């Protein structure tokens, strides 16, 4: 414990005084009430290379983007959309340009005259042109950028008028980037957008035939097909998955969600708001599940079955028995190549604590973890999972992460793209934990095999033994 504190102080001795006090409160030594240990969801210190994004990234790129039959307009200048087009691997099935629009970049392409004179007229004309050119679209969302929030364009009025005139749902999202301190407020704003404009459209409709085994997957964005790899298990247990939020998700599934019997929430940080709203309004119980690795998958499946009758529990036992030999074989094959290794993680708001069980299932220890934009409840949850005298960092900077890695010297680092090559040039294997290094899925029993194979091919790749020239 003392060594970790000493390293924290040594790293902190480089920042100016105000920066030093501010950064002191976001680093802690884990002791398995996070508020008394670490504080989160605070403004980043200027000029320190934070990793966090903006509210637009957390709204358009995370929540609304994966919705496939909708058209999402990045309202403002061209940069945001361009940089966020197809950057996230929220998989889907559809015909792009006809009935699916996830990998497309729709934008208003603001000019100087748009800023000076307003863009509501251009927004209405853009909606008309979208309706003309993409007839099979089932909705429109308008994601605001920074100038839209600054100049006070009344996009809500335009959305209402055009939704009345062309009889389709237009969701205005006030996700201008300067709002908040990270993507968390973008998640929140997108969730109230769904609540106010989409969720309650079928509140007076009783045409849907509901079964006692109705569940809705909440907060799974289908990274590399992850949601699919989960859904099959839930369907092999006799449950009917009505909706997926929002990976490969449709506006119809979101509209149908208030009819389910149970809400299985994967990502708390991004969808807990809508989960609580649905519990309070429609009375649907919701709970968290974890499908990372076999042990957490089995525990989650049994917990899910326990909410239903005996037939579901019997089918759950059958599913566990069926998939047991596969994950046992994967363990027996890949564990000896991985036992004893150490991992340091820095992911956004949910994954730093969910992937720990899968790492443990291969005999690997996590010595450091942290979040980009998580709140205090996330740290409350992750304190139990993390080991004693480990390291926790909230909104870590480039210098702090580099120094922490230099002194701790982990065997593997799992984090985003902006430090992948940084840690690659320091000779430490690195595994993208956002895009799964363009691999996956990692959820479920099928994803566990891919996770293990990726871990082995990265940790044990010979290239890491060749960074020193034989003559030096």
């Amino acid at each position: 414990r003392e060594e970790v504190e000493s390293l924290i102080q040594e790293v902190l001795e480089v920042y100016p005084e105000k920066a030093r006090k501010d950064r002191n409160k976001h680093l802690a030594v884990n002791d398995p009430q996070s508020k008394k240990c670490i504080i989160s969801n605070k403004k980043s210190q200027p000029g320190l290379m934070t990793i966090r994004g903006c509210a637009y990234a957390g709204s358009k790129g995370v929540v609304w983007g994966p919705i496939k039959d909708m058209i999402h307009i990045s309202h403002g200048p061209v940069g945001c959309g361009q940089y966020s087009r197809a950057g996230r691997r929220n998989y889907y099935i559809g015909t792009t340009g006809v009935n699916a629009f996830v990998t497309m970049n729709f934008t208003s392409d603001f000019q100087e005259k748009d800023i000076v004179f307003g863009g509501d007229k251009k927004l209405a004309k853009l909606i008309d042109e979208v309706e003309t050119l993409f007839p099979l679209n089932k909705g429109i969302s308008v994601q605001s950028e920074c100038p839209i929030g600054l100049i006070g364009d009344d996009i809500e009025s335009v959305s209402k008028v055009k939704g009345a005139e062309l009889s389709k749902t237009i969701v205005p999202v006030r996700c201008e980037g300067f709002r908040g301190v990270s993507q968390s407020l973008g998640h929140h704003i997108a969730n109230d957008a769904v609540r106010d404009w989409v969720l309650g459209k079928r509140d007076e409709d009783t045409t849907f035939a509901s079964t006692p085994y109705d569940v809705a997957i909440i907060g799974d964005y289908n990274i590399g097909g992850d949601a699919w790899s989960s859904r099959i298990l839930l369907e092999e247990m006799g449950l009917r998955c009505v909706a997926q939020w929002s990976g490969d998700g449709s506006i119809s599934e979101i509209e149908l969600t208030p009819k389910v019997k149970l809400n299985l929430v994967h990502c708390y940080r991004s969808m807990n708001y809508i989960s609580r709203h649905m519990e309070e309004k429609y009375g649907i119980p919701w709970m968290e599940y974890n499908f990372f690795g076999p042990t957490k998958t089995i525990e989650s499946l049994r917990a899910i079955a326990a909410k239903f009758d005996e037939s579901i529990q019997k089918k759950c036992e059958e599913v566990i028995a069926k998939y047991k030999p596969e994950w046992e074989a994967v363990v027996a094959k890949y564990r000896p190549r991985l036992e004893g290794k150490r991992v340091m993680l820095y992911i956004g708001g949910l994954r730093p604590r969910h992937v720990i069980g899968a790492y443990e299932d291969l005999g690997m220890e996590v010595v450091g973890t942290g979040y980009e934009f998580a709140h205090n409840d996330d740290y409350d949850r992750t304190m139990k999972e993390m080991g004693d005298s480990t390291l926790l960092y909230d909104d870590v900077t480039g210098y702090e992460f580099e120094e922490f890695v230099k002194r701790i010297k982990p065997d593997l680092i799992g984090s985003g793209i902006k430090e992948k090559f940084i840690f690659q040039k320091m000779g430490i294997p690195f595994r993208e934990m956002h895009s799964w290094d363009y691999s996956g899925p990692y959820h479920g029993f099928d994803g566990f095999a891919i996770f293990a194979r990726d871990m082995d091919m990265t940790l044990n790749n010979p290239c890491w033994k060749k960074l020193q020239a034989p003559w030096e």
Partner: protein, 522 residues
């Protein structure tokens, strides 16, 4: 299910029968998808000329643009100076996006900071953000210079960068003599190339405007080279190599080749190479200033002619054969050094490859897109090859550039079927390649989605893509290639001829149907 012997990733795992049944049940039950026949009719309609006429009347909607915003180019220009920190005064999500974009293109660490303005900073200004960010950045990362750009938020609210920096220096946040050049880079005008130009003009102004009393032209016997927005490292390398083989003294301003190509030897080098402050200070003393990409170096050209009194040559980008010769001849005239035998030999080698591949290259129809100078150089080189550019697209182009490209096309019999489009995006280009099918496209990774659409119309309608431009995301290490000079001409030539030959081999691989033309020798 997974077999431990052959683990399947998403492809081809999701092609198993269980996953197909799961997807079928989900789609049939809860997605409310349109009938497949309706989707086919709509897709067919999107490939028709009527849909192209509907698409080309767009005045407010942009779909799949081919440009980025100014601060990206400002950051790229800032990275070309030694121990320089790109500092984007504005919001953080932008610097996050800039870094992500550049890591995906270069597969390299990219260093850039933000002052992370919040709603309170938008309402009250970003002066305190300026001070705290400058102090924190200098203390933490220890640059010799901080190059300040802006995000749009800051531009809209009129944040005075000069006043904020001066107040920072006066209140002791950073030393008075520490160089902090700045440039206003509003994202709602121009594109990334404009941001590069504005940042370079800001740096040149900061280092040269007030100290011109002791400068005389031609005293250091060098030529200033301004590369502009360049994402091929081989371009910097070939310019430097050609000048060095020539014996010409030169100063490459904003050279990021080292910082973007650091070796993996166990340590992380945040700064590498780059133009030095001494070179910037001595720049007015050069014989002349050569702009490699004059069509997005307008403000720099105005500053250099007006202040440094350099008679900037009217040179096209040194791409292809003719324009590389005109660049070499102009440099020889300015410096007085003759063109060495090595350059003549390498030109003759390029001509030899041209005559070797002209038979396969002749008459081929290409669509292409990218930045203005790059696009016009590609057009010129294709004209020199006997190829037929058909759809020339530049989203960030202007009317003067379009007139210049029209003049370039009208001078060759291979430009009669060529139309230049400005302000049009890749959805327009999708319509164009559906209605007037070319043989190939030449452009960045975003064109792959066009290829898919063409293949959905049929194998015979498919237009293969050739990845020359920025950004390239789905291929590895293509950023190491060269496009300028004779070397870039040979690389482009080889890529084109081998793409044509690979397509021809693909169309003639069918046994007892088309293999009669599956020739060993091509």
């Amino acid at each position: 299910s997974q077999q431990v012997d052959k683990i399947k990733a998403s492809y081809p795992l999701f092609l198993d029968q269980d996953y197909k049944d799961m997807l079928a049940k989900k789609r049939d039950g809860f997605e409310e998808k349109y009938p497949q026949d309706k989707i086919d009719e709509v897709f067919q309609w999107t490939t028709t000329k009527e849909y192209q006429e509907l698409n080309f009347q767009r005045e407010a909607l942009t779909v799949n643009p081919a440009k980025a915003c100014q601060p990206l180019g400002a950051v790229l220009c800032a990275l070309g100076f030694e121990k320089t920190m790109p500092y984007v005064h504005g919001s953080q999500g932008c610097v996050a996006y800039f870094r992500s974009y550049f890591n995906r293109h270069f597969r390299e660490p990219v260093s850039c900071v933000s002052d992370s303005m919040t709603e309170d900073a938008a309402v009250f200004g970003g002066q305190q953000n300026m001070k705290d960010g400058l102090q924190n950045c200098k203390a933490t990362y220890k640059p010799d210079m901080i190059a300040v750009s802006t995000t749009c938020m800051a531009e809209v609210i009129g944040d005075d960068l000069n006043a904020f920096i001066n107040n920072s220096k006066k209140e002791g946040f950073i030393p008075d003599e520490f160089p902090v050049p700045f440039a206003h880079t509003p994202s709602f005008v121009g594109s990334h190339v404009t941001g590069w130009d504005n940042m370079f003009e800001g740096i040149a102004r900061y280092f040269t405007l007030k100290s011109m009393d002791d400068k005389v032209v031609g005293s250091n016997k060098k030529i200033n080279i301004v590369p502009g927005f360049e994402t091929y490292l081989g371009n910097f390398r070939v310019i430097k190599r050609m000048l060095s083989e020539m014996g010409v003294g030169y100063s490459l301003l904003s050279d990021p080749e080292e910082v973007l190509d650091t070796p993996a030897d166990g340590q992380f080098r945040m700064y590498a190479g780059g133009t030095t402050q001494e070179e910037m200070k001595d720049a007015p003393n050069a014989l002349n200033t050569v702009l490699l990409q004059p069509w997005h170096l307008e403000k720099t050209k105005k500053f250099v002619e007006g202040t440094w009194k350099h008679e900037v040559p009217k040179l096209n980008i040194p791409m292809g054969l003719d324009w590389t010769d005109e660049f070499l001849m102009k440099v020889s005239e300015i410096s007085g050094q003759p063109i060495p035998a090595s350059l003549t030999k390498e030109r003759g080698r390029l001509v030899d490859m041209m005559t070797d591949s002209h038979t396969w290259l002749h008459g081929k129809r290409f669509a292409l897109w990218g930045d203005p100078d790059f696009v016009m150089g590609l057009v010129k080189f294709l004209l020199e090859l006997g190829c037929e550019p058909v759809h020339i697209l530049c989203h960030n182009g202007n009317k003067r550039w379009k007139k210049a490209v029209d003049a370039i096309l009208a001078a060759s019999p291979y430009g009669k079927n060529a139309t230049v489009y400005i302000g049009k995006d890749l959805w327009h280009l999708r319509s164009l390649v559906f209605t007037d099918k070319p043989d190939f496209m030449i452009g960045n990774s975003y064109g792959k989605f066009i290829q898919r659409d063409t293949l959905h119309k049929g194998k015979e309608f498919e237009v293969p893509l050739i990845r020359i431009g920025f950004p390239i995301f789905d291929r590895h290490h293509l950023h190491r290639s060269t496009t300028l000079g004779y070397e870039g001409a040979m690389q482009i030539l080889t890529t084109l001829v081998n793409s044509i030959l690979e397509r021809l081999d693909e169309e003639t691989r069918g046994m007892q149907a088309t293999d009669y033309n599956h020739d060993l020798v091509r």
